[model samples]
Target: HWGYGKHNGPEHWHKDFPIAKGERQSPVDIDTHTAKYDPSLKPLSVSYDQATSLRILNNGHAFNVEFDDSQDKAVLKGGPLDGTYRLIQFHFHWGSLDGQGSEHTVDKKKYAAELHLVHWNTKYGDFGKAVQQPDGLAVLGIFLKVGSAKPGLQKVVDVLDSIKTKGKSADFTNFDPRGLLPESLDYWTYPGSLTTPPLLECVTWIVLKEPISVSSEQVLKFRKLNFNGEGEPEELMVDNWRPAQPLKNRQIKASFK
Candidate 1:
């Protein structure tokens, strides 16, 4: 239904999903000068089990690495969150070129790509039920820049050919997602919605300040994944990122000064 094509892109999403224009929407541009430093914010604690990784799939929008969330094998806590949030899946958004891709920007500057680690509050039972609540999800956002290749990420890139079309998937076990994170966990926290359609205003976004590096050639591999399924008019999956939405009345708090 919803996509990044000219007719179904972010600009036209509000026609079908009115919440797209709701307050506290996600991927807001983080203005360092305007983001307040709150000394009370604790350091984020993320513990992930490599065995929880299940499979990777191309859902016609972007490729996602799904995990086993039946138990608390992988969890994210502290910082702006109250209790533990169970990790569900993680995905990326990128562009056709090196100049742009990331959903969230820093001072209006775009990165080559962005990684989102989607988690659901254990207090809400499961992801399906949690999605309906305001304090339901906590998404960790990491920016990806074009530079030295990330060996940890290569494992993912290597399997893209197997799932070149929509609805294709492959086993992606024993993968430690923590390897993808930057050295620093310092971040900016805010209340926001899902960047994609059905833009529910239920996410507590924790966007890391530091960015990880990926080779330019690796990003080209991402662009090769097709948005269409087999036998359909081929459409390269690129620019699968939603533009930064208005900050509205929300205040963004930085974990560091």
Candidate 2:
């Protein structure tokens, strides 16, 4: 019952996790008109060795595809970051319906869903040590629009029934995370925090400009999930997202003009 809901939602998160109301908080509205264009921003280097995928787990908050980060099996580099960051896990944020779930909105336009691929700088040795620093983490945000369901996500949806409960998990492997990204490498970069609880301001947000298409039917399946475990009272797992925070004095840079 501690997750995203009216009783204990994003508006009330600051009560327990004080960082929720801190400056540099994430999920900001990105108005491209005001974003400074940075021509020097290089292309993102994403290398994900499919074999590194460990398992898929429903951690009460979101479903995560955990990876083996011990060896840089999957990593992100080059864009707005100073060092190599290994991909540790990736997850999503959605709502009861489409076009209103994504954390970040472009010019006030929302999408059907959003994907977050979390990585940690290797210079800090591990994710735990890195997440406490200013440049410790980097997350790639991919917006999902409603259209033809992409085959790239079929493997993920097929196993949803198995992990519908809060603590369930199943074997997931040989899946390339890159297949889910939009074709264009264009993106907006800024410094923000994790949108969820314990909103640490350590993430370098790289949100893609182009959104990947998915079917409306595919999105409805996400609502089939439950916030509670096997023995707990069933609660529909939807509307699990935080609204855009005030930009304050932060600057958002664009890779495209």
Candidate 3:
């Protein structure tokens, strides 16, 4: 694990990744306690193939699934999401403290952890190429709260035990990432920046009002992530969340209203 320290905390993250500074940063908190900017917001589904054929990546820090829009996934079809955004990579943000590790907050309170499903408009290029494109990022933010344990996240977490810690590239089979989705797709929309380094200014953020329940022990397992002689040094690692950036004149919207 990055170990418990400040060098790896939110403010200093972008310095390490050089990409965390992007204006389109993520991990914003949605506590169902704030004001929503749009009452018509909703998550549009792509085809099931789009969600199913996604390339799952275990980034050591989080689990990301890259999407292939041209594929057909039954779940996606004239989905509520607007425009054409292809599924990209999905990752997570957690804390050193089991109580407040998530990147996204709700009413100023951080949860156990948060998951981000990153997507971009293929009109520009593949997910990698779209990372820098203006209006190219669409991130679905889901909160993970500590509760009774379940294998829901284990399918992904169990792989960590095999990644050699700070490892990437793992084989995940017969597991549906869709199971990770919050029960309610109802979300809040806003124009924001990436939550990590190089924080871009073109992200269309959909902060979910409802967070899925994981477990206290399960969350503890996530907090156990660490690095090696390679990635961000182990001594300067700990929590992976930035302080709430200035709203910067931005407002969040949701369809559940």
Candidate 4:
């Protein structure tokens, strides 16, 4: 059971999971100045059905909304990708403090939080198998800023009370995740790995430039979400984001000029 504490934090990840130090690790700094803008990149094709949301659960890492990916109810194509990718789930990362939680940095600046909408390639037939390939997943990263309260985000915050402890989950359906997105689809794309364990280099990162707003109050609730399971020592869950990795020789391509 890995955690974001002193004993098993990001610095210690490579000790247990050597791939953490791999070349294609994720959550890198999106240095806009150095990023090359690609006009040829196609607009993203996103079609997510509100009914596909099944439940929200705390997996001792982050609270995630799982979807029924058995069908293509929700899919993403086009942006720096060749094949279809099916949405599997969405989760978030935040810090205990107000403004430094996000994993990826924009020009070396950190945001209050970040949201990850995970999707796996359909070409490989299944997510489990697709994960083993080099080009198997695509995760959309949306940054969160402190500002007005997001009405759409309220629905998610309201449910936090039900799943405060780790491993606690409740039925969460009839939600359209699109409502949480900003108006622009402008994003930065690059090749990276999952920010978590095994750190497989199989993701095509799509990080949006515009940030969605969330109230300071809503952000506080995110801190209340426990990291450990019930009866475990109470460690307030926050700052679960991984630090940015080195860019190495990879190029970051922008979707808009």
* Candidate 1 clashes between residue pairs 3 or more apart in a chain or in different chains: none
Who wins the TM-score comparison?
A: 1
Q: Write down the worst ten-residue block by lDDT for model 3.
A: 71-80
Tens digit of per-residue lDDT, candidate 3, span 15-112: 55664544435545454556544544444563433354334554544545454455423222122345677665577777777677676677788877
Per-residue lDDT of 162 in model 2: 96
List clash counts for every candidate, in order.
Answer: 0, 0, 52, 0
Output the number of the lDDT-best candidate.
Answer: 1
Mark the regions of model 3 whose C-alpha exceeds 4 Å error after superposition: 1-5, 13-34, 37-43, 46-50, 53-81, 229-238
TM-score of each: 0.98, 0.97, 0.78, 0.98
Off by more than 4 A, model 4 = none
Q: lDDT by residue for model 2 over 176-220, one digit each (tens)? A: 887788889789999999888779999999999999998887787
RMSD of each: 0.8, 1.1, 4.0, 1.0
Q: Per-residue alpha-carbon lDDT of model 1 for 23-64, expressed as tens digits?
A: 889889999999999999987999985438999999999999
Off by over 4 Å in 1: none
Which residue pairs show collisions in model 2? Answer: none
lDDT of 2: 0.88
Model 3 residue 37 distance off true place after TM-score fit, in angstroms: 5.6
Question: Local error of candidate 4 at 74, Å?
Answer: 0.6
- What TM-score does model 2 achieve against the real structure? 0.97
Q: After superposition, how far is residue 111 of candidate 4 from its true place, in Å?
A: 0.3
